[PDB]
Nucleic acid binder design. Structure first.
Length: 551
DNA sequence: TTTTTTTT
């Protein structure tokens, strides 16, 4: 599988690292060197080596800025960037063209040609088929990365078959027994699964998705069914298991992921009569496709999530599409006890577009500016009683009110110190509360006990290797995204106009829902009014349409 | 303009 000497030498001769040379060859085969001699921008499609790398080498050797191969590849990059920076599955043709202008600063005619060339070469796909509603009316087709279009169609297809075929080997029945503990709405989930292969369960914080899910697990297994429980993250999986009293795992591990791909698929389905997936709000199309591809013929799937939480980082909104297309139980009654909680109340206000009624011993905001703000947040945390007592959250990593700068100040306030060992950003010193960023697993807090030159020991108990140093950062403050699935008694949420592009309803909702007992904000009240008012950035996705053209 | 789930 290794590279022939002169192949490698030549590839490095174009400015590629060894790793890049390996990726190129995996992608192209032996004539990789010939392909990149003919078209260096052919690198745009190789995972790990993008357009940006192709462009740096290209300009480095005085290659023409308006060379059609660059422009063609810029068309592809526009779509790649659409998915990357905003989760789109496609762009209307005029936006794809605009994408190219924006980046390459060529004329519209040059950009139109670049999109046209990409399509006729099959580096991009064009679809203008009406479906249910779109492309013929607005007179503009959708441009996709080819695999994304194939993937969106396949997903809708699996979903369609799942909706349209009843569960079978069937002897699923719902004894009055199994309904105990559950309300009318919750119990219904058990009924719904008697007749249907695909069922969605949604609802917010105080609605009882956990008991409801456990009850599904219980009933199924009493019927002899083999039940697979999973979630998109390690932490989420760990929690599912905890509340279910069972072994729950990552969607990747459940589907037998490895370097060789997903082990489970249509050829070797996941051996489970029922799949329970929690936190589906975090799932993009690609992973949903992988999961559903692995569902045995006739087998069941329960998808559970909260549609008001942050959308997936990856492209698509499949839980949102499915919530509109599948049998879905939307749980709404809040537990009378938890009906009182000022935070639960402020969270529900967000859903009607209102910012929270600040001015309470358990829910209040302190107005601050970005200048010195971080230092101030540290003093606030001290007022609330130290970082053991409060978790700091923020929309962004970067900038004055962001995670890196907030950790820096927190450390300085509570753990002043000279010489630590360097990690993701900054350095770890004994007494530091750090966060594991990679899968034991990602998201988990801890406590540093000691360091050395380039060696680090923290607590569970283990050391820290030079490559592992990259997979660790200070934990006193986290991004709202990183805090997904986790909960604390008291959280200090930083939110301000300085976080402008992140100010949406879903972001503030997730943040608010991280707090069990108390939630204090630092920033501006106006920043909350914006977030409450503003829906999350729109995503281009034709999945719902496809499921419904099908039906 | 921003966030960043996954493995043997």
């Amino acid at each position: 599988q290794g590279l022939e000497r002169r192949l490698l030498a030549g590839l490095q001769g174009l400015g590629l690292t060894i790793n890049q040379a390996q990726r190129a060859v995996k992608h192209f085969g032996a004539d990789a060197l010939d392909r990149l001699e003919k078209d260096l921008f052919t690198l745009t499609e190789v995972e790990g080596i993008g357009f940006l790398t192709a462009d740096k080498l290209w300009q480095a050797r005085g290659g023409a800025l308006d060379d059609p191969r660059r422009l063609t590849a810029a068309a592809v990059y526009a779509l790649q960037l659409a998915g990357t920076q905003a989760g789109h599955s496609f762009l209307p043709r005029s936006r794809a063209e605009k994408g190219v202008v924006h980046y390459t600063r060529v004329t519209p005619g040059q950009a139109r040609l670049a999109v046209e060339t990409a399509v006729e070469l099959g580096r991009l796909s064009e679809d203008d088929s009406p479906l249910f509603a779109e492309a013929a009316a607005t007179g503009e087709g959708r441009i996709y990365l080819p695999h994304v279009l194939r993937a969106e169609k396949k997903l809708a297809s699996l979903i369609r078959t799942l909706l349209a075929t009843p569960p079978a080997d069937d002897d699923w029945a719902v004894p009055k027994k199994a309904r105990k503990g559950l309300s009318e709405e919750q119990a219904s989930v058990l009924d719904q699964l008697a007749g249907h292969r695909l069922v969605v369960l949604t609802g917010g914080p105080g609605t009882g998705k956990s008991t409801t899910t456990k009850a599904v697990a219980d009933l199924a297994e009493s019927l002899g069914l083999e039940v697979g429980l999973c979630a998109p993250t390690g932490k989420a999986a760990r929690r599912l298991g905890e509340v279910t009293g069972r072994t729950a795992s990552t969607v990747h591990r459940l589907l037998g992921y490895g370097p060789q791909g997903f082990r489970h698929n249509h050829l070797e389905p996941a051996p489970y009569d029922l799949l329970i997936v929690d936190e589906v709000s975090m799932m993009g199309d690609a992973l949903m496709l992988s999961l559903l591809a692995a569902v045995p013929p006739g087998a069941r799937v329960l998808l559970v999530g909260d549609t008001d939480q942050l959308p997936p980082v990856d492209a698509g909104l499949p839980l949102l599409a499915l919530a509109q297309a599948a049998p879905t139980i939307k749980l709404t009654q809040v537990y009378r006890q938890a009906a009182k909680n000022p935070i639960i109340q402020a969270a529900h206000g967000l859903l009607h577009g209102e910012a929270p009624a600040w001015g309470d011993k358990r829910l209040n905001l302190t107005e601050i500016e970005p200048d010195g703000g971080a230092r101030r947040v540290a003093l606030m945390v001290r007022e609330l009683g130290g970082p053991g007592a409060v978790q700091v959250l923020t929309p962004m990593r970067k900038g004055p009110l962001g995670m890196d700068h907030l950790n820096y100040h927190l450390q300085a306030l509570f753990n002043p110190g000279e010489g630590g060992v360097r990690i993701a950003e900054g350095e770890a010193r004994p007494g530091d509360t750090v966060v594991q960023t990679k899968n034991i697993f990602n998201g988990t807090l801890g406590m540093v006990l000691k360091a050395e030159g380039a060696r680090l020991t923290v607590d569970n108990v283990v050391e820290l290797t030079g490559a592992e140093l990259f997979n660790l950062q200070l934990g006193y403050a986290l991004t709202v995204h990183r805090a997904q699935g986790s909960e604390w008694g008291t959280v200090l949420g930083v939110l301000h106009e300085a976080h402008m592009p992140m100010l949406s309803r879903n972001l503030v909702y997730t943040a608010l829902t991280r707090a069990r007992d108390r939630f204090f904000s630092a920033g501006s009240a106006s920043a909350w009014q914006i977030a409450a008012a503003r829906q999350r950035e729109a995503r281009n996705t034709a999945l719902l349409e496809r499921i419904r053209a099908h039906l």
